[PDB]
Design a protein around this ligand. Structure first.
Ligand SMILES: CCCCCCCCCCCCCCCCCC(=O)OC[C@H](CO[C@@H]1O[C@H](CO[C@H]2O[C@H](CO)[C@H](O)[C@H](O)[C@H]2O)[C@H](O)[C@H](O)[C@H]1O)OC(=O)CCCCCCCCCCCCCCCCC
Ligand SMILES: CCCCCCCCCCCCCCCCCC(=O)OC[C@H](CO[C@@H]1O[C@H](CO[C@H]2O[C@H](CO)[C@H](O)[C@H](O)[C@H]2O)[C@H](O)[C@H](O)[C@H]1O)OC(=O)CCCCCCCCCCCCCCCCC
Ligand SMILES: CCCCCCCCCCCCCCCCCC(=O)OC[C@H](CO[C@@H]1O[C@H](CO[C@H]2O[C@H](CO)[C@H](O)[C@H](O)[C@H]2O)[C@H](O)[C@H](O)[C@H]1O)OC(=O)CCCCCCCCCCCCCCCCC
Ligand code: CLA
Ligand code: CLA
Ligand code: CLA
Ligand code: CLA
Ligand SMILES: CCCCCCCCCCCCCCCCCC(=O)OC[C@H](CO[C@@H]1O[C@H](CO)[C@H](O)[C@H](O)[C@H]1O)OC(=O)CCCCCCCCCCCCCCCCC
Ligand SMILES: CC1=C(/C=C/C(C)=C/C=C/C(C)=C/C=C/C=C(C)/C=C/C=C(C)/C=C/C2=C(C)CCCC2(C)C)C(C)(C)CCC1
Ligand SMILES: CC1=C(/C=C/C(C)=C/C=C/C(C)=C/C=C/C=C(C)/C=C/C=C(C)/C=C/C2=C(C)CCCC2(C)C)C(C)(C)CCC1
Ligand SMILES: CC1=C(/C=C/C(C)=C/C=C/C(C)=C/C=C/C=C(C)/C=C/C=C(C)/C=C/C2=C(C)CCCC2(C)C)C(C)(C)CCC1
Ligand SMILES: [Ca+2]
Ligand SMILES: [Cl-]
Ligand SMILES: [Cl-]
Ligand SMILES: [Fe+2]
Lengths: 78, 334, 35, 450, 135, 341, 34
């Protein structure tokens, strides 16, 4: 009933899989960590940091109202 | 031999068109009582002072309701959890005004459905079946008991039981959400998974069986005539259905054992409904759904809204309007 | 015996698992953000 | 006994079914599980003691075991203030250590002890069909349960007494000197309607009735123990019941479901065996307290609360119950059966008394009503107190809510377990628990329905 | 923005005095408020009498004004009616009556000052502070 | 062997994950939809479209994250990354809610691809395609709710947001503004879904409790063999049981399984028809006869009129926060509310 | 952005680890399928 590929239990019970993955899996975990912890995520996605939801001049919700010029609108919201 | 033995043989007879049984000897009278009263009250009952504030609510068709709006109205908040049989009313008119029909119908209905579940066991025993259809039936029974008995008990009044009507059901639901946030309660989430998944699995199983039917008919007659009642031969090709499904998702996700498949079909919705019944039964004691109102604060300390806050706004809107004349004090505790 | 290492299955496995682990690391890091 | 499917016929997920006829292994499982119970009692008590702020009320701190110890009269004094924290610690320790011992014994029996006990001793060996031995074990355990009931009685009478929330001068630990042995009261409790205003046994409202009922329970249980040691089941019982291990399990499951439902109701309504001092207000208590709080406030403002009609025309503050009694108005009309030690000094023969309401309300009653109104058993699953539309800053869920909800859920699932095992026991006794025999399919010998 | 110094700057006394809580002072004040005052003053409301809330208008309308930190601390030592006519020290939690208010016998003067400062800072972060019970 | 047939061979190989020609549409589009949703719920805010935090990065949890609908100012703009709004700026595209159409559109085409996959695999293995026909139900729901309803409304903003609490918000919004519970088409949907769950439970239990004694173990699961020719449970006994318990019973297995398909699928389709109605505000909001009687007779109260009052309260209290682009300003004194609450 | 460098370097480390521990057999397989 096998379509050709190695069974998963075989692979994940092998030494070589674990020599590879005890490195690769933690590396991805800590890459995602660092992505968050360096602040890169905020800048990449434009998500406000806890101190940037409001500014010393905009105390209300920065709701977009403009149909085509949202870059300027966002920059004026800060 | 004896008259009693002959009666026993009759009640427990598997030859009766409708099985009676010992549980049936309670089911039939109580269910007929509930049905007769329900029909009479839904058609012709006068208005009921559900909130106990002398503000009677018209439930019956003759008082201006349609089928959608009609209901048997829960008994008065003044009654609370007190037993209100007909003989405790000074007059039938008094009994009706205070919502006695609701109590009569509900108590008989609940006795009847528990006896129905017992009767399912009894007949399976008489037929030499396995005994657990009644266990599956205990899920709807649990939910019905939660909405008609447990929730009023926790809340302290049959006035807070689900009304016996369509719009009344909706009213019950809206107020329940306003007061308990049932949507944000994981047991209701599990109930939703139960019913969505049960419908999914019903569709999936029905469609796979229908897809793998063995050719026994022509294109003119219904393929249903390909199955003859009481054949042992299988009417569909389960191996072809497994081939299809294990290629649709992947091989090891598809059942090839019909027994395990049907156990799963039984168990999934039943467990989901048990969980949602328990959710309603525990919100009866005001252990409510999750409250994330003002969970996210900005650095200064201002609240940042989430969809939970929007939901709470809707809940407040429902809450401030419900039973608009019933509250004298600022907290809806009772 | 002696199966191929890389396959369509390998790719389907990783396409999901790899971003999953990265995202989990990100969300773990999120757990210690202070306001 | 086998330990796999081919040699037992049970899968791993039903593996404990393999123990049905291995009496020694089954005893080991039971003793180890009893160890788990006692372990949780001890560990949870130690946790609660560690997480206890002894000047903040118990019900504000997520405690369910400490109130049980306080109600028994240990470590508390007037109004339930925690005098000595050491008795709570000792209860927890004793349970933890005996749990160690129970776990060791259960492990011995389950893992090394004799597989079956019947060929080692007639006394401890049992057969599920041995009606005499089954009733012997019922008898031994009935004697033990009667002893436990009399232990409660002895604690209340001769070992410091119990906490009486109804104590004059204020709720306090008091010694019960005159328990009611009068069988009329004791067993008329069992005859009261399970409905509003009667509250079948939930309505027991004085430690004298509780202690006297426990004296009666002790005597009944001990006499039943002796009765079952010295007799065998009669013909009627033999003909009506299924006599098998799974049948006895199903019977006990039904019993447990009943008890769980009863306890959930008991903790929800009763404020005598569950003093509000330790368990917080009942929902009824909190609603009544809100009505009382605003009656008092508006009266101080000058409202004539006797004659003030609300918007609907019913009295804002006071009204009549359907039987005429003077009760708090508003939705709390449903809760007029409520009785609590802070409210009864204002109740006259007719219900609430205008004269007491106008010149007998004490500052401690005002404080208590405020406290109880603000600790109404309302809360979210993540322990945000108050009505569900409130915001996150009040971390409270009533212990009554935790106990009632948990015990209703356990009662239901044990009813389900009773149904499962009763059905299975019947089917196995009749021999069709494994499916329909194709040769003798009963329906095939049955006439068609129409 | 941050929980800045100006945001933490609040009236100290009635003569125009001014005190700034530190971040630690504000955090302890919030902690105390949630532990002992959130049961009756969630979101600045007064569950048992919402004619007298913790809002800025209500706080300043008392006699004397309670919109400054010293007056709040005085109230928490010796609670009075809103017009300052009756003695509420048997009816309101206060540090002066640990015999009837045990939840308060462990609080210092620093703790009371912190909670009063939090009471003054919270309204400007929440437009719902001190409104209607259902609001 | 032409290159087309060589490709067809490779695509239709028996492997762990069948690809097929339909996989060309399904897998990239399903991946886009799923990864977009995960990315949005992990990292992307709704601060500029809704004034809401909607991602784990902002402190939300599983229940409160969402790929929120785009700002109402964009109408029904498809909001391509390269479109006139975001103009290729990925960060802005995230901030304006470009992920919502991204997920919605890739999901619609992934759903198409999945149903094509059902057809393709059914054809290859040689069975009738009733699984695809059944899947048409979920497709109708997705098209009607996530595409047709917002297209009838002012903008994508009123589409359901791809999140748990976002969906709950959509649900309550439909109750309060459309009185969706009163809608007969929703009622038929409810009946279909509840009946499907009932059928699932009752059929599974019936089969499990009419099994033939085909093995010696108490474990009855190992007394089945997929190649066995005979029925594994007694249809005759099942029919007799249900005839005597309920009065009627299935006697035709094929009809039973077709009914199990027909009920939930028909329910989904009817509720989709109702949602199409709501897209144009064509609601079953009111019963005019009762409205008129109540407007003239201040003693006439039904559960219907009570529900109307609840809806009024919900709209007034929720609109300012739920529709922040509108700048609704409802002073406290205009909010409807009952006594003392 | 140095943040990009520190976020990418673990990915490259994982990739090169997997390569150095699987490359012989991977190239074997690549060659065999031509
Ligand atoms: C086999 C046997 C089957 C037997 C069936 C007979 C009926 C059983 C169920 C009774 C239904 C009662 C409904 C109303 C209950 C009620 O008014 O309230 C609860 C009552 C207690 O009544 C209350 O009792 C209270 C007692 O408190 C009083 O006394 C106290 C003393 O401290 C306090 O002072 C308090 O302030 C004071 O009010 C008050 O009297 C209340 O007015 C009164 O309502 O519980 C009770 O008496 C009885 C306990 C009820 C158990 C809960 C139901 C179990 C449901 C299971 C559903 C399972 C479904 C599975 C499906 C599959
Ligand atoms: C598909 C995937 C779906 C699955 C997703 C993942 C699910 C995993 C399984 C569940 C995981 C449990 C979450 C564990 C965290 C937790 O629970 O967290 C809660 C606590 C630990 O957190 C503490 O929880 C406390 C809870 O309040 C309690 O303490 C407070 C402060 O003292 C107050 O006193 C308050 O009144 C009191 O209730 C406070 O919030 C503390 O601040 C907080 O730190 O763990 C505890 O309590 C321990 C609880 C164990 C016993 C609970 C018994 C429940 C009884 C009946 C249930 C009835 C109905 C269930 C409905 C559903
Ligand atoms: C079977 C299912 C299989 C599955 C398929 C899944 C794949 C689907 C791929 C298709 C995606 C469709 C996107 C449709 C976008 C759209 O429509 O976008 C809408 C635009 C029109 O734009 C809208 O137009 C409105 C009216 O404007 C007009 O009026 C205004 C006021 O007077 C102004 O004057 C304005 O200048 C003027 O243009 C408003 O401006 C809105 O803000 C604006 O969004 O139509 C258009 O692009 C095109 C209009 C013609 C084609 C419409 C086809 C779809 C129609 C569905 C039913 C619609 C309504 C019934 C609902 C029920
Ligand atoms: C009757 C049982 C019971 C009750 C009423 C309580 C009540 C309480 N506990 Mg507790 N506890 C229990 C058992 C119980 N516990 C057990 C068995 C353990 C060992 C794990 C603990 C260990 C524990 C700790 C460490 C703590 C508590 C705490 C608390 C308090 C906070 C509750 C909370 O937020 O939890 C949250 C609620 C949940 C996590 C939901 C649980 C839902 C379960 C999974 C329901 C299962 C459903 C069903 C039975 C599934 C089987 C059915 C099947 C057929 C499908 C509260 C008063 C806290 C406290 O305040 O200490 C002072 C605390 O820190 N408990
Ligand atoms: C209900 C629980 C229970 C039951 C029915 C049994 C039953 C049995 N045990 Mg076991 N055991 C238990 C718990 C239990 N045990 C626990 C908790 C431990 C850990 C200490 C042990 C450790 C243990 C060992 C090491 C052995 C047994 C053995 C036996 C068998 C012989 C009994 C005998 O003749 O010795 C004589 C009985 C007595 C001398 C009576 C003494 C009664 C106790 C010890 C004194 C306290 C009485 C107390 C006041 C009564 C109420 C208890 C209280 C906590 C409420 C027998 C079938 C033996 C065996 O299997 O033989 C082959 C054996 O080797 N047990
Ligand atoms: C857990 C403790 C326990 C257990 C498991 C048993 C078990 C048993 N006892 Mg029993 N018994 C006990 C304690 C216990 N007893 C005590 C403490 C006493 C002293 C009072 C007795 C005195 C006693 C006597 C005199 C007899 C038994 C008998 C029996 C056997 C059959 C009885 C029966 O069918 O039950 C169920 C009861 C019935 C089928 C009769 C119907 C009872 C009514 C109609 C049920 C209605 C209850 C109601 C719905 C619940 C509401 C609560 C409340 C308001 C009543 C059975 C093995 C019989 C026996 O075989 O003798 C050796 C017998 O004659 N026992
Ligand atoms: C004292 C109570 C009691 C006892 C002694 C038994 C004993 C037994 N049961 Mg039973 N049962 C009970 C109560 C009990 N049951 C209840 C209350 C129910 C209703 C749910 C059932 C329903 C039931 C079924 C359907 C079956 C049994 C079966 C059995 C037999 C084997 C079971 C086994 O191996 O477990 C193995 C244990 C597991 C597989 C683990 C189960 C884990 C559960 C489902 C979730 C735990 C949730 C819990 C609250 C913790 C939450 C965790 C959270 C932190 C995530 C065995 C003799 C089997 C049988 O009939 O044998 C002939 C069987 O098929 N029981
Ligand atoms: C297995 C066997 C385990 C032990 C069995 C019982 C031992 C308990 C004896 C303690 C008695 C108290 C002695 C001191 C004293 O008089 O009171 C001293 C203090 C306070 O108790 C005071 O006693 C006075 C004596 O006349 C008065 O009665 C006072 O009113 C009273 O307050 O008691 C304590 O602090 C002990 C708390 C009691 C807890 C014991 C129950 C838990 C143990 C059993 C659970 C384990 C089960 C395993 C399974
Ligand atoms: C058989 C079996 C089983 C079971 C088991 C069991 C059930 C058990 C148990 C057991 C137990 C039940 C146990 C125990 C224990 C205990 C201990 C071990 C203890 C102790 C101690 C200590 C050490 C303490 C200390 C302390 C003190 C003294 C006080 C203070 C605090 C502290 C904590 C420090 C299972 C399922 C696995 C499976 C297989 C089979
Ligand atoms: C302590 C106390 C008290 C007391 C109590 C008492 C005194 C009791 C009791 C009780 C009792 C004394 C009981 C009982 C019971 C019984 C039961 C529960 C039963 C039953 C039944 C059954 C189960 C049966 C069944 C059957 C039938 C129906 C027929 C056929 C056969 C059979 C068996 C199946 C009081 C309240 C005062 C107070 C509080 C505390
Ligand atoms: C956006 C976008 C895109 C896409 C992307 C993608 C496609 C991605 C992705 C992604 C992904 C794909 C991610 C992932 C993930 C994941 C996660 C986040 C997970 C999780 C989980 C969990 C948490 C689980 C848990 C559990 C449970 C609950 C049960 C049992 C146990 C366990 C542990 C399993 C592109 C660039 C094209 C362009 C632009 C836009
Ligand atoms: Ca407190
Ligand atoms: Cl309403
Ligand atoms: Cl009220
Ligand atoms: Fe089937």
């Amino acid at each position: 009933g096998t379509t050709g590929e190695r069974p998963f239990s075989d692979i994940v019970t092998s030494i070589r899989y674990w020599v590879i993955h005890s490195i690769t899996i933690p590396m991805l975990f800590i890459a995602g960590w660092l992505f968050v912890s360096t602040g890169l995520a905020y800048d990449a996605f434009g998500t406000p940091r806890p101190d940037e939801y409001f500014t010393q001049t905009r105390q209300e919700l920065p709701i977009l109202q403009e149909r085509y010029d949202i870059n300027q609108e966002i920059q004026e919201f800060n | 031999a004896s008259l009693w033995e002959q009666f026993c043989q009759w009640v427990t007879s598997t030859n009766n068109r409708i099985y009676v049984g010992w549980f049936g000897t309670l089911m039939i009278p109580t269910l007929l009582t509930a049905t007769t009263c329900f029909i009479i009250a839904f058609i012709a009952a006068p208005p009921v002072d559900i909130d106990g504030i002398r503000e009677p609510v018209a439930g019956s068709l003759l008082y201006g309701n349609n089928i959608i709006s009609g209901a048997v109205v829960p008994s008065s908040n003044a009654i609370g959890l007190h037993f209100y049989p007909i003989w405790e009313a000074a007059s039938l008119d008094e009994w009706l005004y205070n919502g006695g029909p609701y109590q009569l119908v509900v108590f008989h209905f609940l006795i009847g459905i528990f006896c129905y579940m017992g009767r399912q066991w009894e007949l399976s025993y008489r037929l030499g079946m396995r005994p657990w259809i009644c266990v599956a039936y205990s899920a709807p029974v649990s939910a019905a008991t939660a909405v008609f008995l447990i929730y009023p008990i926790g809340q302290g009044s049959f006035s807070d039981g689900m009304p016996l009507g369509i719009s009344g059901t909706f009213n019950f639901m809206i107020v329940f959400q306003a007061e308990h946030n049932i949507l944000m309660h994981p047991f209701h989430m599990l109930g939703v998974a139960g019913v969505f998944g049960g419908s999914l699995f019903s569709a999936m199983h029905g469609s796979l069986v229908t897809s793998s039917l063995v050719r026994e008919t022509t294109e003119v007659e219904s393929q249903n005539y390909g199955y003859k009642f009481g054949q042992e031969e299988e009417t569909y090709n389960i191996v072809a259905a497994h081939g299809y499904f294990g290629r649709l998702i992947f091989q090891y996700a598809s059942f090839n054992n019909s027994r395990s498949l049907h156990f799963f079909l039984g168990a999934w919705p039943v467990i989901g409904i048990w969980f949602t019944a328990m959710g309603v039964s525990t919100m009866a004691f005001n252990l409510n759904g999750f409250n994330f109102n003002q969970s996210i604060l900005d650095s200064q300390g201002r609240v940042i809204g989430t969809w939970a806050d929007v939901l709470n706004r809707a809940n407040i809107g429902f809450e401030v309007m419900h039973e608009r004349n019933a509250h004298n004090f600022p907290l809806d505790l009772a | 015996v002696t199966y191929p290492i890389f396959t369509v299955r390998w790719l389907a496995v990783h396409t999901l698992a790899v971003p999953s682990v990265f995202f989990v690391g990100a969300i773990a890091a999120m757990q210690f953000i202070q306001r | 006994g086998g330990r796999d499917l081919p040699s037992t016929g049970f899968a791993w997920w039903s593996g404990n079914a393999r123990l049905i006829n291995l009496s020694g292994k089954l005893l080991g499982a039971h003793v180890a599980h009893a160890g788990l119970i006692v372990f949780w009692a001890g560990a949870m008590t130690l946790f609660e003691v560690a997480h206890f702020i002894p000047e903040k009320p118990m019900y504000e701190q997520g405690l369910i075991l400490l109130p049980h110890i306080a109600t028994l009269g240990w470590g508390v004094g007037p109004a339930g203030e925690v005098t000595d924290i050491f008795p709570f610690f000792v209860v927890g320790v004793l349970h933890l250590i005996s749990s160690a011992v129970l776990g060791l014994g259960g492990i011995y029996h389950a893992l090394r002890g004799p597989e079956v006990l019947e060929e080692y001793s007639s006394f401890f060996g049992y057969d599920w069909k041995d009606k005499n031995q089954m009733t012997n074990i019922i008898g031994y355990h009935l004697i033990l349960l009667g002893c436990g009931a009399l232990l409660l009685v002895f604690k209340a009478m001769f070992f410091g007494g119990v906490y009486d929330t109804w104590a004059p001068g204020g709720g306090d630990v008091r010694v019960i000197t005159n328990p009611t042995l009068n069988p009329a009261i004791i067993f008329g409790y069992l005859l009261k309607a399970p409905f509003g205003g009667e509250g079948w046994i939930i309505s027991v409202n004085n430690m004298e009735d509780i202690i006297g009922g426990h004296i009666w329970i002790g005597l009944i249980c001990i006499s039943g123990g002796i009765w079952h040691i010295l007799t065998k089941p009669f013909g009627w019982a033999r003909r009506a019941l299924i006599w098998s291990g799974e049948a006895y399990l199903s019977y006990s499951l039904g019993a447990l479901s009943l008890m769980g439902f009863i306890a959930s109701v008991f903790v929800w309504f009763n404020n005598t065996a569950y003093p509000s001092e330790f368990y917080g207000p009942t929902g009824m208590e909190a609603s009544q307290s809100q009505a009382f709080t605003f009656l008092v406030r508006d009266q101080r403002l000058g409202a004539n609360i006797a004659s003030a009609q609300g918007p609907t025309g019913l009295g804002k503050y006071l009204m009549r119950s359907p039987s005429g009694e003077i009760i708090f108005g508003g939705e709390t009309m449903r809760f007029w059966d409520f009785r609590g030690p802070w409210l009864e000094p204002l109740r006259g023969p007719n219900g609430l008394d205008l004269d007491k309401l106008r010149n007998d309300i004490q500052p401690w009653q005002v404080r208590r009503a405020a406290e109880y109104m603000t600790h109404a058993p309302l809360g979210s699953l993540n322990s945000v107190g108050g009505v569900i539309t409130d915001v996150n800053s009040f971390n409270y869920v009533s212990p009554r809510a935790w106990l009632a909800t948990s015990h209703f859920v356990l009662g239901f699932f044990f009813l389900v377990g009773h149904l499962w095992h009763a059905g299975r026991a019947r089917a196995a006794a009749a021999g069709f628990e494994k499916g329909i025999d194709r040769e003798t399919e009963p329906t095939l010998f049955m006439p068609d329905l129409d | 923005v941050e929980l800045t110094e100006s945001t933490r700057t609040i009236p100290l006394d009635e003569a125009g005095g001014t005190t700034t809580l530190t971040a630690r002072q504000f955090t302890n004040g919030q902690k105390i408020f949630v532990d002992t005052c959130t049961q009756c003053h969630l979101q600045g409301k007064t569950k048992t009498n919402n004619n007298v809330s913790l809002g800025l208008a209500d706080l300043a309308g008392a006699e004397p004004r309670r919109d400054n930190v010293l007056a709040l601390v005085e109230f928490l030592k010796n609670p009075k009616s809103y017009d300052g006519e009756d003695d509420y020290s048997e009816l309101h939690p206060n540090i002066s009556r640990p015999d009837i208010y045990p939840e308060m016998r462990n609080y210092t003067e620093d703790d009371i000052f912190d909670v009063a400062g939090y009471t003054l800072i919270a309204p400007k972060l929440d437009e719902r502070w001190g409104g209607t019970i259902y609001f | 062997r032409g290159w087309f047939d060589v490709l067809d061979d490779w695509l239709k190989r028996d492997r762990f994950v069948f690809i097929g020609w339909s996989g060309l549409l399904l897998f990239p589009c399903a991946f886009m939809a799923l990864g977009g949703w995960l990315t949005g719920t992990t990292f992307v805010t709704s601060w500029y479209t809704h004034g809401l935090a909607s991602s784990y990065l902002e402190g939300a949890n599983f229940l409160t994250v969402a790929v929120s609908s785009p700002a109402d100012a964009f109408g029904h703009s498809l909001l391509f990354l390269w479109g006139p709004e975001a103009q290729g700026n990925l960060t802005r595209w995230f901030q304006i809610g470009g992920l919502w159409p991204f997920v919605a559109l890739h999901g619609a085409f992934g759903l198409i691809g999945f149903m094509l996959r059902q057809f393709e695999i059914s054809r290859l293995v040689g069975i009738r395609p009733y699984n695809a026909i059944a899947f048409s139900g979920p497709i109708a729901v997705f098209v009607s709710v996530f595409l047709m309803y917002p297209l009838g409304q002012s903008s994508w903003f009123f589409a359901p947001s791809f999140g748990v609490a976002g969906i709950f918000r959509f649900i309550l919004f439909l109750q309060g503004f459309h009185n969706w519970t009163l809608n007969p088409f929703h009622m038929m949907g409810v009946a279909g879904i509840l009946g499907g769950a009932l059928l699932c439970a009752i059929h599974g239990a019936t089969v499990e409790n009419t099994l033939f004694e085909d093995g010696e173990d108490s474990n009855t699961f190992r007394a089945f063999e997929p190649t066995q020719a005979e029925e594994t449970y007694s249809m005759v006994t099942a029919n007799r049981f249900w005839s005597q318990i309920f009065g009627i019973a299935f006697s035709n297995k094929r009809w039973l399984h077709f009914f199990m398909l027909f009920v939930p699928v028909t329910g989904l389709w009817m509720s989709s028809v109702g949602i199409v109605g709501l897209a144009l505000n064509l609601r079953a909001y009111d019963f005019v006869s009762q409205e008129l009687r109540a407007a003239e007779d201040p003693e006439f109260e039904t559960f219907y009129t009570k529900n109307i009052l609840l809806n009024e309260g919900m709209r007034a209290w929720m609109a300012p926060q739920d529709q922040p682009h509108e700048n609704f300003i409802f002073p406290e004194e205009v909010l409807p509310r009952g006594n003392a609450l | 952005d140095w943040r990009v460098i520190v976020v990418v370097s673990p990915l490259l480390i994982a990739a090169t680890w997997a390569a150095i521990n699987i490359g012989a057999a991977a190239i074997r397989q690549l060659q065999d399928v031509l």
